Amino acid sequence: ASLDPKTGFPIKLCGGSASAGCQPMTQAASILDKQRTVLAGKITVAANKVPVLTAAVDKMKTAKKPKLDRDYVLRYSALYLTTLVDAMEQYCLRDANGAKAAGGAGLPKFKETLKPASSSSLYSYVDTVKSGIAAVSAAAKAGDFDGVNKAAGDIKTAADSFLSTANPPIIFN
Ligand code: CLA
């Protein structure tokens, strides 16, 4: 019904009718819906790791000689924020062009010729996270501890907002 906070994994038997059965061979979910639960689970893991940065930045400022580890803030941004932004963009793509993005147009390639992730209803939330990445990097260069904390909070609100409007089908295959 929801996705695990850390692992991100998902948390009726009729004859002649799929009846949205969870059991395999009775599953009514499309491969697109299964791809959407995967992307949503990956969005869930990255957003739930935003609290971990907030704690690290608080430990940095409380230290006797406060210093901002540009390397930690930039490495967390490289490891979690790129993940979250790319996954949000992919969810937006699958929503905008439907099956075409699930492999219906072939191997991922340049000149995709499918509806872009931009112009999606949920794309505005992806723009908020892109601003959050820029703030996390700008604050780290500046040395502003408060800037990193709020920017991570802005990303956390945006990712939670995305999932709520997305209403991703949770599929236990
Ligand atoms: C065995 C290796 C393996 C495994 C387990 C996965 C697993 C995954 N990949 Mg990866 N991937 C792999 C190899 C693998 N990949 C390779 C080699 C490539 C390069 C071609 C990719 C390229 C790739 C991309 C580009 C994407 C994934 C995605 C995914 C996720 C969703 C699965 C999916 O899209 O199925 C989709 C499967 C198909 C479209 C067809 C494959 C054939 C199916 C699985 C078998 C059906 C059997 C059927 C019942 C019998 C025949 C029926 C008859 C009618 C024909 C999942 C985490 C997606 C994702 O969400 O991750 C971000 C995604 O966007 N993968």
Residue numbers in the entry: 56 to 66, 73 to 234
How did the manuscript describe this experimental structure?
The R. salina cells grown for six and 12 days (corresponding to L-phase and S-phase) were harvested, and utilized to isolate PSI-CAC complexes. Comparison of the four structures reveals how cryptophytes adjust their PSI antennae in response to the different growth state.
Local refinement targeting the PsaQ in PSI-14CACL-phase was performed, resulting in a final local map with the resolution of 3.5 Å. The overall folding of this protein is similar to the PSII extrinsic subunit PsbQ. One chlorophyll (Chl a323) is coordinated by the C-terminal residue N234, while the other (Chl a322) is presumably coordinated by a water molecule. PsaQ possesses a long loop between helix 2 and 3 (2/3-loop) which, together with the two chlorophylls, inserts into the membrane plane at the interfacial region between CAC-i and PsaB. Moreover, the N-terminal fragment of PsaQ fills in the gap between CAC-i and CAC-h. Multiple hydrogen bond interactions between PsaQ and CAC-i/PsaB tether the PsaQ protein to the lumen surface of thylakoid membrane. Our structure showed that Chls a322/a323 of PsaQ are in close proximity to Chls a616/a606 in CAC-i and Chl a816 in PsaB.
